[PDB]
């Protein structure tokens, strides 16, 4: 009985263009635990993405919070790709400073 | 601290 | 104020690829304080906060050998679950298990926990009295009985009522100058010029704790009957949380829509609007 990841990319502090911050990636409501989470920048990976340890909620649905330091400039787009056996099509959520 | 499970299903 | 101490075990079977992967993880409230992950060199119990670095080194040796025990015990619950649900190896099945104390406005157990899930579904559950059981199907019924005749809840009851509450009181002390205290949400309303003659009013709430909040939009004081986007409360990472709610309104008519935040840390319920 498989369940599907639910990604949500967002800054930690109000993203003032130019100032250092932390990007987040929040994959939830999935099953089983086995998942890959890599955060991106214009397409290429970030080499130190810190990840939260495999834990879950009351209803048993799993949870991970990957994070990383980023400085959001004019454009340079950020993102979160996610590999899972719940879907052979890797979901790709891109970052949006308004959301 | 945790404890050592003493039951098995 | 109310707190808790909660540990989450997760075991996944992986045939062909060697032995099952076990992972324990502790949590004081929503803050995570410890870990054990068999996916390791020579695994051992490690802190996950600068505050847990100050405990006696005997502490880690204990929880390392205890968790290695449980890890080996969860290999048995997995192969036993195979026999019950009449399944077969080769496949991947996982076990989850949340156990832990819950305290209120006093140092005395409010509710205790000890519950198992198998393949995304409840299996067995120690009830609130801490000496009876609940089984979800007939496979778990065979476990319930094994546990009922033996009296195996006497061991959980003894830990949860006792040792557990003593240690939460210990950890809330150790980590008193960091652990999120109840904190009030900071709220504002951005607007976003959405395609075709109508602006998107989005409503924000940032830097709060605990995660339990209510955001709602109202038109002219009363319940909304258009639609609104509503993303689930999400971890900032610094210990506080973030939610937004967004309704789409026509240009010029933005003054008739007010956001409505509701949080325990707010003494009076908040009502925002554009500008």
How crowded is residue A83: how many other Cβ atoms within 10 Å of its Cβ?
15
Q: List the one residue out of C54, C211, C92 whose CA is nearest residue A65.
A: C211
Q: Give, in order, the Cα–Cα distances in Å from C27 to each of A36, C133, C165, C274.
A: 23, 25, 14, 39
Question: Burial code of C69-89, b = ≥16 C-beta within 10 A, e = fewer?
Answer: ebbebbbebbeebeebeeeee
Distance CA C183, CA C210 (A): 7
Residues belonging to chain B with any Cβ–Cβ distance to chain C shorter than 8 Å: 1-9
**C95 and chain A in contact, CB less than 8 A:** no
Number of H helices, E strands in chain A: 0, 8
Q: How close, in Å, is residue A7 to chain C by CA atoms?
A: 11
Contact C43, C68 (CB under 8 A): yes
Residues belonging to chain C with any Cβ–Cβ distance to chain B shorter than 8 Å: 7, 24, 26, 59, 62-63, 66-67, 69-70, 73, 76-77, 80-81, 84, 116, 123-124, 140, 143, 146-147, 150, 152, 155, 159, 163, 167
Distance CA C192, CA B2 (A): 50
Instruction: Determine whether the interchain pair A54/C25 forms a contact, defined as Cβ–Cβ distance below 8 Å.
Output: yes
- Domain chopping of chain A, boundaries: 1-99
Considering only alpha carbons, which residue of chain B is nearest residue C9? B2
Question: Burial code of C205-221, b = ≥16 C-beta within 10 A, e = fewer?
Answer: bbbbbbeebebbbbeee
Q: Give, in order, the Cα–Cα distances in Å from C266 to each of C72, C184, C209.
A: 47, 6, 11
Instruction: Determine whether the interchain pair C163/B9 forms a contact, defined as Cβ–Cβ distance below 8 Å.
Output: no
Contact C34, C46 (CB under 8 A): yes
Chain C CB contacts of A26 under 8 Å are 234-235
Contact C7, B2 (CB under 8 A): yes
Q: How was this structure determined?
A: X-ray
Which 3 state secondary structure label does DSSP give A89?
strand
A1-99, CATH topology level = Immunoglobulin-like (2.60.40)
The neighbours of chain B, by the rule of 3 or more Cβ pairs under 8 Å, are: C
Bridge partners (DSSP) of residue C37 are: C23
Contact C213, C186 (CB under 8 A): no
Name the residue facing A67 among C27, C231, C237 (closest C-beta).
C237
Q: List the one residue out of C5, C23, C6 whose CA is nearest residue C14.
A: C23
Q: DSSP labels for chain C?
A: --EEEEEEEEEE--TTS-S-EEEEEEEETTEEEEEEESSSSS---EESSTTGGGS-THHHHHHHHHHHHHHHHHHHHHHHHHHHTT--TTS--EEEEEEEEEE-SSSSEEEEEEEEEESSSEEEEE-TTSS-EEESSHHHHHHHHHHHHHTTHHHHHHHHHTHHHHHHHHHHHHTTTTS---BPPEEEEEEE--TTTEEEEEEEEEEEBSS--EEEEEETTEE--S-EEEPPPEE-SSS-EEEEEEEEEETT-GGGEEEEEE-TT-SS-EEE---
Chain C CB contacts of B6 under 8 Å are 152, 155
**Cα C208–Cα C211–Cα C216 angle in degrees, nearest 5:** 85
How crowded is residue C238: how many other Cβ atoms within 10 Å of its Cβ?
12
Contact C273, C202 (CB under 8 A): no
- What distance separates the 2 farthest-apart alpha carbons in chain C? 71
Instruction: Determine whether the interchain pair C235/A60 forms a contact, defined as Cβ–Cβ distance below 8 Å.
Output: no
Bridge partners (DSSP) of residue A78 are: A41
Parallel/antiparallel/unpaired status of strands C122-126 and C94-103: unpaired
Identify the helix (H) or strand (E) that includes residue A78.
strand A78-84
How crowded is residue C145: how many other Cβ atoms within 10 Å of its Cβ?
12
**C232 and chain A in contact, CB less than 8 A:** yes
Name the residue facing A55 among C25, C119, C192 (closest C-beta).
C25
Distance CA A16, CA A14 (A): 6
Distance CA A41, CA C59 (A): 41
Instruction: Determine whether the interchain pair B3/C163 forms a contact, defined as Cβ–Cβ distance below 8 Å.
Output: yes
Q: List the one residue out of C182, C217, C183 whose CA is nearest residue C200.
A: C217
Contact C275, C228 (CB under 8 A): no
Name the residue facing B1 among C59, C81, C146 (closest C-beta).
C59
Residue C134 dihedral angles phi and psi, to the nearest 5°: -135, 125
Chain A CB contacts of C94 under 8 Å are 31-33
Q: List the one residue out of C45, C47, C75 whose CA is nearest residue C60.
A: C45
Contact A45, A28 (CB under 8 A): no
Domains of chain C with CATH codes: 1-181 (3.30.500.10), 182-274 (2.60.40.10)
Q: Is the peptide bond before C7 cis (omega within 30 degrees of 0)?
A: no
Chain C CB contacts of A22 under 8 Å are 237
Q: Give, in order, the Cα–Cα distances in Å from A97 to each of A24, C91, C170, C263.
A: 12, 42, 41, 25
To one decimal place, what's the resolution in Å? 3.0
Which 3 state secondary structure label does DSSP give A86?
coil
């Amino acid at each position: 009985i498989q369940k599907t990841p639910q990604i949500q990319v967002y800054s930690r502090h109000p993203p003032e263009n130019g100032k250092p911050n932390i990007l987040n990636c929040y994959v939830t409501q999935f099953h089983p635990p086995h998942i890959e989470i890599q955060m991106l920048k214009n397409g290429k990976k970030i080499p130190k993405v810190e990840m939260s340890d495999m834990s879950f909620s009351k209803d048993w649905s799993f949870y991970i919070l990957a994070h990383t330091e980023f400085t959001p400039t004019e454009t340079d787009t950020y993102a979160c790709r996610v590999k899972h056996d719940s879907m052979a099509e890797p979901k790709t959520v891109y970052w949006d400073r308004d959301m | 601290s945790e404890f050592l499970l003493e039951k098995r299903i | 104020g109310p707190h808790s101490l909660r540990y989450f075990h997760t075991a996944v079977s992986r045939p062909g690829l060697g032995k099952p992967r076990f992972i324990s993880v502790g949590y004081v409230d929503d803050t995570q304080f410890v870990r054990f992950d068999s996916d390791a060199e020579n695994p051992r119990y490690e802190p996950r906060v600068r505050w847990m670095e100050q405990v006696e080194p005997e502490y880690w040796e204990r929880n390392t050998q205890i968790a290695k025990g449980n890890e080996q015990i969860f290999r048995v619950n997995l192969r036993t679950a195979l026999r019950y649900y009449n399944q077969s190896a080769g496949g991947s099945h996982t076990f989850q298990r949340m156990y832990g104390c819950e305290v209120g406005s006093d140092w005395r157990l409010l509710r205790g926990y000890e519950q198992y899930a198998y393949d995304g579904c409840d299996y067995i559950a120690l009830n609130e009295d801490l000496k009876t059981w609940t089984a979800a199907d007939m496979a778990a019924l065979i476990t319930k009985h094994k546990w009922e005749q033996a009296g195996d809840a006497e061991r959980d009851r003894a830990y949860l009522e006792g040792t557990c509450v003593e240690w939460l009181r210990r950890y809330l002390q150790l980590g008193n100058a960091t652990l999120p205290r109840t904190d009030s949400p900071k709220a504002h309303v951005t607007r976003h010029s959405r395609p075709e003659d109508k602006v998107t009013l989005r409503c924000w709430a940032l830097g709060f704790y605990p995660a339990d909040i209510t955001l709602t939009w109202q038109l002219n004081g009363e319940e909304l009957t258009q639609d609104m986007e509503l993303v689930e409360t999400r971890p900032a990472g610094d210990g506080t949380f973030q939610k937004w709610a967004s309704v789409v309104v026509p240009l010029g008519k933005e003054q008739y829509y007010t956001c409505h935040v509701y949080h325990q840390g707010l003494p009076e319920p908040l009502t925002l609007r554009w500008e």
